[PDB]
Scaffold this active site. Structure first.
Site, PDB file in Angstrom:
ATOM      1  N   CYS A   1       3.579   1.860   9.352  1.00 22.13           N
ATOM      2  CA  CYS A   1       3.453   0.656   8.561  1.00 22.13           C
ATOM      3  C   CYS A   1       4.827   0.222   8.076  1.00 22.13           C
ATOM      4  O   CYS A   1       5.715   1.041   7.806  1.00 22.13           O
ATOM      5  CB  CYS A   1       2.505   0.892   7.389  1.00 22.13           C
ATOM      6  SG  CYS A   1       0.788   1.158   7.912  1.00 22.13           S
TER       7      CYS A   1
ATOM      8  N   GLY B   1       2.426   6.332   9.467  1.00 29.77           N
ATOM      9  CA  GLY B   1       3.837   6.257   9.177  1.00 29.77           C
ATOM     10  C   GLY B   1       4.533   5.048   9.761  1.00 29.77           C
ATOM     11  O   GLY B   1       5.692   4.799   9.420  1.00 29.77           O
TER      12      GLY B   1
ATOM     13  N   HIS C   1       0.804  -1.215   0.000  1.00 29.50           N
ATOM     14  CA  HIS C   1       0.000   0.000   0.000  1.00 29.50           C
ATOM     15  C   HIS C   1       0.845   1.276   0.000  1.00 29.50           C
ATOM     16  O   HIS C   1       0.266   2.361  -0.113  1.00 29.50           O
ATOM     17  CB  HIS C   1      -1.103  -0.013   1.069  1.00 29.50           C
ATOM     18  CG  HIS C   1      -0.629   0.130   2.474  1.00 29.50           C
ATOM     19  ND1 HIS C   1       0.090   1.215   2.920  1.00 29.50           N
ATOM     20  CD2 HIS C   1      -0.842  -0.652   3.556  1.00 29.50           C
ATOM     21  CE1 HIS C   1       0.335   1.077   4.214  1.00 29.50           C
ATOM     22  NE2 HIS C   1      -0.214  -0.053   4.623  1.00 29.50           N
TER      23      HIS C   1
END
Ligand SMILES: [Cl-]
Lengths: 305, 305
Positions: free
Chosen positions: B145, B143, B41
């Site tokens: 991830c 932030g 993503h």
């Protein structure tokens, strides 16, 4: 979202841990520049610990009696001295992994991370606080002495604790990196007991703010209080008295959430008087007091190192 | 003595964290040998996340669109591919800090440490468990991830989790390092809700053993039970059914303490039916279920890495 008991990343400290052996005793040392710091009781036997005279015991020790090993490689000891309750072992090689560092003596209520080590090897990391009675509630087994506690400010490690002793009650005592014990404790096996384990009120309030930020709000109420009124309840429940300094430190969390500090104090007052009623806050069924206001801001904002 | 929620030392993983930026999106990647792993993503906008077609979105991306930075130094991307829900970015330099490592897919009930990171920089470390509903209760902000979860066996890091998503309820979902989500979750912003958050019974029992080893014993009683009788109570309280496999795994803790597993089950049964009565166990006012039997043995014995 989410709020966890979080330690600092431990890599900068892992690179400083060494093994120190004197005779039959092995514990951990901290290698910074060309000095290794460790508890002076490394020179003691289990017998010696009842009534050790460290200056006399040290007369029988020479540089070559202090065996210092960094991983699989031996360090050469070129001098040694005693400073309060720690030994400083001068070695012939500066630690190439030395981070930027400071030695700080922390105040009761401040938190720090502990890197628990055995035989110079890191075992785990966890978060602690200097309790108001100058103990810490850690996880230490025989061989863990010399493990250190620290905080990190971007790239600078502030070392604040070195582990020395376990009291008969299962709590822990130690020194700053100048070798001065926190509180009244001494490095002898004697009758020394901890005082009242007071709850760190400003930290509980910070954690309640953390709860509101992260969705847990059931404990907010329609009430307010004053410092003096709240402190009457704090005393009854063995909480630290709240001061205006504490109020000011909570200012940023109050601004972020829009909840006045004294309103949050009134929420805490009701929680102390009525309990939790079987409910939880941030996954806890008791009021957590080992997050400082700075810890909460840090974790809720994402500060890195 | 003492028993703490303890994470693994994080240094071996700190050396693998990098920043990955695609267009306007920045998150974390894991650099092992000459491959950087990150959530796919990263290629999405906030709009794209409602209904992303990742294969179509990836057509518009080239190697030079993936900006990978290790500290202050840029890495050169020489290839990229999608595997399930992760991207593998091949770089021209092997990470010189790559530890011995494995990729493992863990079972619900297993624990691991998370190194929370932002912009490729470590922020903190904490301990989690894969919940029975395949969520984890972490601490993750925008932030974070690409932050990873791991276990260490002496010198080998077993990576088991990479962080991808937060559900509207504040719990967290992610993948193994092959990019397969734990549980039914997907990397889209949609209506997906977590199932029942079952309590990990074998872990509670391990923690009760830890309590006995470390001095907390008030909950021991004069009773015993059977697996089938205990499981009638486990069901009522949304606990995982206890199996003979669980009993066998607790064998070593039963041998150490002399408390038969089914006797400890009878203690747990009384705690579930009667509550704690305002008492605590190892500093907790609820029954902790994020220590595995192996965690307890490890911490109570001093295993290092
Ligand atoms: Cl609790």
């Amino acid at each position: 979202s989410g709020f966890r008991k979080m330690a600092f990343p431990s890599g900068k400290v892992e690179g400083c841990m060494v093994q120190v052996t004197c005779g039959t005793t092995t514990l951990n040392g901290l290698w910074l520049d060309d000095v290794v710091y460790c508890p002076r009781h490394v020179i003691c036997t289990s017998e010696d610990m009842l009534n050790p005279n460290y200056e006399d015991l040290l007369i029988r020790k020479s540089n070559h009696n202090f065996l210092v090993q960094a991983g699989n490689v031996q360090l050469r000891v070129i001098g040694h001295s005693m400073q309060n309750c720690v030994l400083k072992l001068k070695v012939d090689t500066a630690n190439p992994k030395t981070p930027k560092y400071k030695f700080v003596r922390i105040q009761p209520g401040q938190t720090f991370s502990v890197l628990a080590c055995y035989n110079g090897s890191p075992s785990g990391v966890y978060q602690c606080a200097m309790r108001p009675n100058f103990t810490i509630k850690g996880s230490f087994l025989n061989g863990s002495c010399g493990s250190v506690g620290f905080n990190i400010d971007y790239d600078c490690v502030s070392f604040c604790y070195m582990h020395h002793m376990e009291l008969p009650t299962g709590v822990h005592a130690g020194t700053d990196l100048e070798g001065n014990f926190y509180g009244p404790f001494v490095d002898r096996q004697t009758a020394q007991a901890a005082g009242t384990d007071t709850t760190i009120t400003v930290n509980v309030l910070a954690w309640l703010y953390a709860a509101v930020i992260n969705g847990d709000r059931w404990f907010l109420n329609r009430f307010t209080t004053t410092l003096n009124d709240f402190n009457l309840v704090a005393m009854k429940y063995n909480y630290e008295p709240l001061t205006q300094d504490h109020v000011d430190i909570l200012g940023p969390l109050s601004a972020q959430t829009g909840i006045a500090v004294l309103d949050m104090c009134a929420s805490l007052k009701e929680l102390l008087q009525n309990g939790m009623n079987g409910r939880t806050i941030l996954g806890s069924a008791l009021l957590e007091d080992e997050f400082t206001p700075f810890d909460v801001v840090r974790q809720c904002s994402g500060v890195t190192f």
